[PDB]
Amino acid sequence: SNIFKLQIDELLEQVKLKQKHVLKVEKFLHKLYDILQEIPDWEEKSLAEVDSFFKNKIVSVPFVDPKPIPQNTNYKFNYKKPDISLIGSFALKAGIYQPNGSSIDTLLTMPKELFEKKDFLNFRCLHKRSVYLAYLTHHLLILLKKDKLDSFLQLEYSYFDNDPLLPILRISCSKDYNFYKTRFSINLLIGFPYKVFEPKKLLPNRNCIRILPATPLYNFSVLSSSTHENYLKYLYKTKKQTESFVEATVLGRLWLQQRGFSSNMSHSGSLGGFGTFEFTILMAALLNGGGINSNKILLHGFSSYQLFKGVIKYLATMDLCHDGHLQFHSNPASKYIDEGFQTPTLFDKSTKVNILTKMTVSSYQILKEYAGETLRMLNNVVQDQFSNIFLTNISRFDNLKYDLCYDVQLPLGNNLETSLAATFGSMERVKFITLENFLAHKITNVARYALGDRIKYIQIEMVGQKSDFPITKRKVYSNTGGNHFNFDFVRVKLIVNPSECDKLVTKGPAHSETMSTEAAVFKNFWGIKSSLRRFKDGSITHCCVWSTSSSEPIISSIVNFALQKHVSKKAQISNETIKKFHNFLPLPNLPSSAKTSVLNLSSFFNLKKSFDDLYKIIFQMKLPLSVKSILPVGSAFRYTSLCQPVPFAYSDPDFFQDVILEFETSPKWPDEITSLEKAKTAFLLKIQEELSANSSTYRSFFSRDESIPYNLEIVTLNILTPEGYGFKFRVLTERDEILYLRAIANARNELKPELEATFLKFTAKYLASVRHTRTLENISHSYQFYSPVVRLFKRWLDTHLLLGHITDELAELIAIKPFVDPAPYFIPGSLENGFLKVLKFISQWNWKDDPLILDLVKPESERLTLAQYKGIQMNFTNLRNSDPNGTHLQFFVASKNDPSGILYSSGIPLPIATRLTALAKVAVNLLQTHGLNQQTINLLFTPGLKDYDFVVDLRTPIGLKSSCGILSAPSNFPENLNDLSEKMDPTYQLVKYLNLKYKNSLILSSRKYIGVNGGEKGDKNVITGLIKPLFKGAHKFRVNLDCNVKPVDDENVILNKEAIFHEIAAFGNDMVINFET
């Protein structure tokens, strides 16, 4: 807690505003009040008379739609001296430094004599307010000229909190009174006196626009406009009572900004409605009560951490929208009501004002999810979470912040089509003041009703919506709008539910004798798409059936049909980014591959079933030692293989899945290594013979494995299953592991570091591999999108020639970090969201100073405890102490399976580690510069290939794409097993050996999967190399130089590049075609 408390204090002083600018603004607006005093009064005027007053003036009255017409504007207009006051955060002195800038809210109280008791009907008070603003702007403008301040002051109108009904004047300063450095803008709010209109008449249920339907939005604006100082006085009291009021406020402010939460309007579409004031008003209420029994949940003695914890805890678990609401008295213990108004409600009995009126239902769930999601990190003790909760902006990219994004282009967008405009209807102008508010509600409701359980959260954003307009104009002007609609286009963003996203059929209400209302709306909503279907269980229900595709999810089709049918038949819905991502995933060459969804693992299961049949045979075979257990460890067994398994597609590198065979513990195992495997081979030999005799349909052969250094006698049995799958079997013996330890102990001190590396690979293949496949497999079920995203991640690495040096396990652990540790983000539920988040992590990962440690557990045991957590931390510090610059080790990946942290990340050259991070950083930079689109995504997955010193082009004799099981094909294994090799791609084996020979001098790379990244034929692969700095320049000759060089002087040599190329060329033989240097 002490660490967290000090972290808070550090954050506050960093964001603390500089007091010098406070004086600078205080100097200005203090004089501004004097200018307001000069402004003269006015007499009663009709709309005709005020219009004559403003016909020729540069200023234009910003009348709120519907603008007053001569018939209904019988009530007259007048201006009188307001009672100025300063309100907002600046009044409470709780503001902070904001690079984008802050705003100071100065309130103008229209004198009460300028209103009638019934001016809150039919925009009567609003239009009076508009001219009052207009009259002030004219006089303020001329006086600004008189004082010569106009030179550096720019004046424009704007909507308060993006509220179209409340235009305001904004003062900002361009580059003595110049406050441009202060980064502040004075906002002039024309508020109403308190209690001018009976608040009971302004309750949300009541209506104030005659046409009856209620007017919650219109009622809130006028009532809120009349209640500003009262809340300030309410807040002003509280900060005395609790010493930590302003501190608790700013922590809320920073938290809200990172999540992209603001006080601005939300029914328009912008995510927000919950701002500092709502955070402050809420937290004030909790200090006065908040419980069902009206007990205090927060105490004035609480510190900033406790005050912040309670409000975040409060918002997380108690519901304010559907079931339950709060009432408090600003002027009486606050109590939680179980009843709900179906909308975010924070009632104030003293003022009869709901503070959450601007807060939308859809946004409220997201707000609730964030608080509850953060409450989990706040309670977390294993890991520090200060940075994530507060120092991480998740609103930078929507696609990172939202799983799916669809942009919809409405028709006729210099006015919207008559049909869509006609759909607006009069009941909705009274309900929704602006068509933008109505249209956002329309698209939300159909999208929510259509998708249902397929999604968790939906956000509708109106791209290109402006809120400030020139003083010469009455309302905001959009380029496509033509003063009709203030937006460019609508973007539909979702947080999908992986569990039920891809369901083929959307279930509906059950059949009945009489058509029920719920069923009725179901049939009407889906129209022809509606159908009544029966199932195996025998239930009869109304449901509509969709079709799965390998290119796009069901979510794309449903929203397209639903929006077109209800919103407008001419709408255009397009999300090509996900489609391009889907296409990059290699399409398997199985029946109905195209119609298969990306989340289906039937291919993997079929491979497992084939293994099960063999798994039975080997048990029943009699051997000298009873078989103990066979543990499959292949990539496909954990649903991580880049391309799905395909029968007889033996050209695939991952065709042969490794399998560990272990026998009963015996004392007769050889005590010397070389005999031990040769005994293991003897066991494999007998297994092959009996398998050949009893089960002739199975085919088998032996192969040479040399992955473990210096153990040149480990022999593996490759089994070709009749279903068309390959399995590689290796024997594990308990004596095996001690023998390697024996080798390390007896080895010379200089050689011990080499031997331990040999052990490191052994445990990586035999011991840790078992644990790796087990946990990833089980975890993969909860994380539906893990199996796809990892495969694209490996595909992305292969394109840039990184898989050759990066072990497949390491890629998996990097790719699961966004899932086991999604904070501050959510669990990815989309292919795009998961992949880019992996990119985001790698870009910002400081592997030199920050270790990567993962809790391989299912979503909320085996969770890392404090002792284990600290233990892993000490390991990183000890390693970095020996390797500060990180040459020997770059990536530190540890978990329960890997406490050492070096198992899967050892031996990677630093250039490849830097190249990996360098690629991730640049990729993120491209995203910021240019948005996700077809052009960018192509750049992400195409290799530059120019940075490499020399590049070698290779082509295989035949196209391997068909034999790899990739649909742009063998149906049986060759009669002669020697004929497997002719359809193989050996370039990786070429590179690995060439790496060994030129380890001291060169770093060669190539594409592992040629069928995927080898063109249409899958036959072209490229070998790329790098010359180290030391051998790039000339060197003095010495015996230990260990490089192919040529003389220049009697004691100087230089790298012999041309000789190396010839060695490379003839090694590939006919494979090599061209050399680029």
């Binding site: 030199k848 990180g886 830097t914 195409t942 530059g944 490499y948």
Partner: peptide
């Protein structure tokens, strides 16, 4: 075009 990043051999990008 393509994603091209200058190869770093001193871990300077980090």
């Amino acid at each position: 075009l393509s994603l091209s990043a200058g190869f770093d051999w001193t871990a300077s990008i980090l």
